Structures are given as C-alpha cells and as structure tokens.
C-alpha cells in the first residue's frame, strides 16, 4: 500500500509524526523506530521533547535505530545522534538500551557489521531481515535517501548495512541497504519546503524505472510506503 | 489536509475502512457516519456483517446516515438503505433508532427538509451546520459525488439537502449539499477498478476550477479529505 499525506504546514506534519510517536508508545510491545537526522527530524526532536509528548510518551516501549550515520565523534556538529541527543534524549527519560546508536567514531566496515548484527539480534526478523516498525526517511535534492545515493545503491544488496560515501563531500557513513527499508512494516518519507518541490514534482509522474533515485525505487514490499509532504513541497503536483 | 491511499485489492480498501469503522465504535461516544451506496459499500456492508466485525463492532456507539437516497421505498432495489439493511443491518444488532435512513418513499422536498433538522438537532454544529465524523463518498465516471451533479450543483447553497434530479434518468433523490460535506471531519472517495481510471487522471492532474466535477471541487475545509484507490482505479497514475 502506498499512502501520501498533503499537509498544509511543515509543523502539522511534525505534529503528526509526534502522535503516531505516542500511539506506538502505548501498545505495549517493543516497537522499532529508524530515525533520520536533517530538518524535519529535527523538528520532530523539539516537539518530542516539549510538554505534553515528552512525559505522555512511554519511552520505555520506543527503540531508536538510525537509517544512516555520519562517521564522527557522536558530540560531532555532523552526528545525527548527536543533534537527536542534544534535542530529545538528554531532555526526556528514556533507558539508555532503547537509544541503539550507530558508532560513528569508529572504523566503518566493522561498525556496519556490528550495527548489522545488532539489528538482526534485537529485532524481530523476518527471513534472517530485521523488520522494523517504522522507518522515517528523508529525500535529497538528489533522491537520495538515507546514505542509499543515485548511482551507488546495490538494490541487490542482501547486507543489511553498508559503507557508503557522500556523493561531493566524500564524508563516510554507515548506512542502511534497501533490503532492511524494503522489510519495514511502514517507512515514511518526509519531504518538506519548497526546496524539494521540483524532485516531488519528478518521482510522483515518471515510472520509477526512469529516474537514478533511491527514493524513487524503494519501498515497502508488503507494508506501507508513505510519502509525508507540506504544501510548498507539492506545489507542482498539487 | 489530504490523504490518498493506494491499495493492492479491494478486499485491502474495505479491510482499512472496516478497521477505522472498528476504531470509531471503541471511543464510548456517538459516531456520526455518512454512507453513500454503490459496488465499494456493498463491499463494506458484506465485510461489515462477517466475522468479527459483526460482533466486535460497538454498533451502539455508530450513527448511520446516507449522503444521498433514491426517491424509492425502502426495499425497491434502488434504495441506497435497502441495500445496506439486506447486507449489513439485518445481520447484526445495531440500535434502530442509531439508523436514520432518508425516507425514499416520501413527498422529497418535505423530505429534504426533515432530513435536513434531523441532521442539525443531534450532530454537534460548527457555524450551524452538523458536523460528521466520517462521510464516505462515491465518484461517478461524471465526476458527481452523493447527488451533486455537474452542471446542477449550487456550491454556495446554504441549505442542509436538497432534492436532485439524476441528469440522464429524473430519477429523483435527496442528497447532502456540498456545505455539510465541507464541515466534516473527513471525508473519503472510495474510487475502485479500472472504469475509474481516467476519470482518477483527470482529477490527479487537473486544477479543480478547470474542472466540471463535484468531486474535484468539494473537499473537507478544515479537516481530512481522502482518495482510497485500488491498483486498477491508479493504473493511469501510478
């Protein structure tokens, strides 16, 4: 099932977010959350940590995963555990073993595969895959999504995690493969500003099997793929 | 906000609104639903009236009441209600008096009027219109919804009903005007199979005020208004 949401404002879709947040906190059962780092994110991190969401939610029931990491110190301006840290963890009270970082500081290759394993260790999996609950994803200028980059991407990658590079930066990261994205109950790209309203205006009318981009091939194969916009990113489409 | 939602099959469609339907009736408090007839309610209704829907659904908790009604008694296989008693309410124990059919059978302006107070008197108002929790719509390869046809409908009309007439037969009926469609909750296309396809394109793809349709015009103003597609109903899309 595909599903997107037109939203008329990018805190209404943070605000969204933040409930979804809540009703899985309150099911009971472990649930597997893949963060994002980026804009959106970060806004959702405010609002997760401000009154009510931040003594409403039960944290103890939520595990953060990260889709990608940049290879830095986690107090590095460029770790996105850092920022969600900074924003959200160091302000609500959460036990430490939910947060699963990925560690940037460290030699790369062996990270994937101790992150790798960590997955396949802690959630549920489906065909040795880890199943995640809920993937929150972004798109690049470039339809890039996690560090899953346009030419770069082995769709047949059976890893659940790779090296890959920033495109112009050369900067490491420890990513996600499509494989894991793919097995996800629901992944959720949130793709907001006027800045992204030409790419939105290029997945949503051409077949995917024409575009270079990540975000335009990967999806759910048996949940739900979602696409989370604002008004000035639908723009051209709506 | 809008919400387009693409599912695989149609048994998927009624699955999801079976499920909302499901939610609606845990909240201990009255539930004010519009139903529209047609091959995707009928489809409802029969899933509605299985196992465990049957039994799970808090039906005292749930209002029925009809976007629109044929000017026919209700048990001519014409009426929207008839329909829906033969697949659904005779098949499960629902409060009648939480059943309020348009009455078919009866002088139609007298009826549009009564229809008209019925709705006012017990569903909460917002700027003297009642306010539905859900409306569930249809979208005719003429793009009209409930009995609101191109061509014949007054979108400013600040009446409650009216009484339409069908533009190829006369057949009569009395039906919600744009206005209290525009004061719900959230309202649903419910658009399925591949007779659906191009009429789908042309709303996806064209400004509502270059087009004639009712269904590309009317949305929810402060809420929720939804597409629910199958595969065949987007193949032209998507």
Chains 1, 2 share one sequence.
Request: proline share 6%; with cysteine; glycine share 6%.
């Amino acid at each position: 099932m595909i599903n997107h949401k037109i939203f008329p404002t990018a805190d209404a879709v943070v605000k969204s977010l933040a409930d979804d947040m809540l009703a899985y906190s309150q099911q009971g059962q472990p649930v597997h959350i893949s963060l994002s780092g980026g804009s959106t994110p970060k806004m959702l991190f405010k609002l997760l940590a401000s009154q009510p969401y931040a003594n409403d939610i039960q944290w103890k029931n939520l595990h953060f995963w990260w889709g990608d990491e940049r290879c830095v110190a986690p107090d590095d301006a460029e770790s996105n555990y850092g920022e969600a840290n900074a924003l959200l963890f160091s302000k609500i009270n959460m036990p430490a073993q939910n947060i699963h970082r990925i560690l940037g500081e460290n030699e790369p290759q062996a990270e994937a595969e101790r992150f790798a394993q960590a997955m396949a260790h802690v959630i549920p999996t489906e065909n040795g895959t880890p199943v995640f609950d809920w993937i929150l994803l972004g798109v690049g200028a470039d339809g890039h999504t996690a560090s899953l980059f346009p030419g770069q991407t082995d769709y047949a990658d059976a890893n659940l995690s790779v090296v890959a590079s920033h495109p112009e930066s050369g900067q490491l990261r420890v990513s996600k493969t499509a494989k894991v994205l793919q097995a996800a109950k629901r992944i959720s790209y949130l793709v907001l500003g006027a800045g992204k309203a030409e790419i939105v205006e290029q997945i949503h009318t051409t077949p995917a099997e024409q575009l270079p981009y990540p975000a335009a091939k990967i999806h759910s194969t048996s949940g739900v793929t979602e696409w989370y916009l604002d008004s000035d990113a639908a723009a051209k489409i709506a």
